[PDB]
Structures are given as structure tokens and as C-alpha cells.
Design a protein around this ligand. Structure first.
Ligand SMILES: *[C@H]1O[C@H](CO)[C@@H](O)[C@H](O)[C@@H]1O[C@H]1O[C@H](CO)[C@@H](O)[C@H](O)[C@@H]1O
Ligand SMILES: *C(=O)/C=C\C=C\CC(C)C
Length: 17
């Protein structure tokens, strides 16, 4: 789970994001 907020992939945390 990559992310932790917003950007290129979208918003939240989501398995290779
Ligand atoms: C994400 O958080 C909330 C979910 O209900 C809402 O305030 C908005 O949907 C918010 O979305 C933001 O991100 C998208 C791109 O991922 C933009 O299009 C929106 O304008 C907003 O900045
Ligand atoms: C979070 O992003 C951690 C691992 C992700 C692996 C990729 C997934 C198996 C498609």
C-alpha cells in the first residue's frame, strides 16, 4: 500500500500506488 493522501495514482492507499 503506497499513497497516504493524494497525487498521481488517486487518494488513500492502494497496492503499488
Ligand atoms: C477527496 O476527498 C473527499 C471525498 O468525499 C472530497 O472532498 C473530494 O472528492 C476529494 O477529491 C479531490 O481529489 C480529486 C482527484 O483525486 C479532485 O478531482 C477533486 O477536485 C478533489 O480535489
Ligand atoms: C502496497 O502497495 C504494498 C505492496 C504492493 C504490492 C503490489 C500488489 C501485489 C499488486
Amino acid at each position: 500500500n503506497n499513497x497516504x493522501x493524494x497525487x498521481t495514482f488517486x487518494x488513500x492507499x492502494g497496492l503499488x500506488g
